[PDB]
Amino acid sequence: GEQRPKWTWELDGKAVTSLITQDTVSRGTTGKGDIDYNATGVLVSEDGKTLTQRMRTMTTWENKWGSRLYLLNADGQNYEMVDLKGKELAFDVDMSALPCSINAALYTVEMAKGGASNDAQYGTGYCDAQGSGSGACNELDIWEANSAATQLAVHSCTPAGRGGTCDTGGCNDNPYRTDKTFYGSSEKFAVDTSKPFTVVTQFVTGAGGALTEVIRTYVQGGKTIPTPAVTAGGNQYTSLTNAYCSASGGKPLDGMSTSLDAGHVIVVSLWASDDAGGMDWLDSGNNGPCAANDPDGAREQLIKKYPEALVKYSNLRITTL
């Protein structure tokens, strides 16, 4: 029998336990095969607080593809549904083992609670902003990052549910575009990715209940670290707002605002592109210091150069603003 890891997190100060379940792609030809989480490199600490996700794991066979994980309700049949509007989501993260061209992602999508066919325990029904038909839905990329760069993105789609038209580029910010010393793997950076830090995201609503602002802050060494003010259309912005989204060539927050009312699934996906330059949008050119079109950045080479590449997430908390 499959033994899904239990991840304990905090919802308005109360200890909630969710199950961790891996995507159907990893479950063999039926897509409903059992997962050995030790073999896919997915570990929760004894205290239930820390999730370790490895890119490459060798046991009696070799996991070379990291993992896409969903938070599953304790019922073991439905995804753990969240509505982040008027909430803040915070987690502690160790990014120190994530080189250029890897993507440690923690995000939400408007997947159906039951997945494809009331079978969420098998990690079915995935959708995101890059999909088509049943594979297309609103995507809130809270976290897509390595030790060298990070991006926050809202991908509004209309209509909501599956199969809408999506902003594939998203309303997004990467602090490197404004300040190349904000985020990186030494004490020379405002956020030192060689050491653990807290990622805080506020999903601010208006009186009417519409999502109006997405605010990113970091905490490290007890210091609260705001994101650099970003220039778009000659104006400075300190958060994702409809004005910023418009000015920066993204779609506004409105599609996402409607979508979050349906409930989202929390996705934890550690991945690398099979193509050289597949992650350059995140961490190369004006988005980060990483080598562009790096053949060594392709998954198969990355896992050979950095066989211990992994992410740790701790103390996931969702709190009402």
Radius of gyration of the chain (CA): 18
Read off the tokens for 206.
């208006």
Choosing from 2, 46, 62, 139, the catalytic residue is 139
State the Cα–Cα distance between residues 8 and 314, nearest whole angstrom: 9
Using CA atoms, how far residue 14 sits from 10, 22, 319, in Å, is 5, 25, 10
Q: How far is Cα of residue 188 from the mean position of the Cα atoms in its chain? A: 25
Amino acid identity of residue 92, one-letter, is D
State the Cα–Cα distance between residues 153 and 36, nearest whole angstrom: 32
Choosing from 62, 80, 144, 187, the catalytic residue is 144
Is residue 139 annotated as part of the catalytic site, yes or no? yes
Residue 302 is inside which H or E element, if any?
A: helix 299-305
State the Cα–Cα distance between residues 21 and 42, nearest whole angstrom: 10
Q: What is the DSSP string of 1-21?
A: -----EEEEEETTEEEEEEEE
Is residue 80 annotated as part of the catalytic site, yes or no? no
Residues annotated catalytic, as ranges: 139, 144
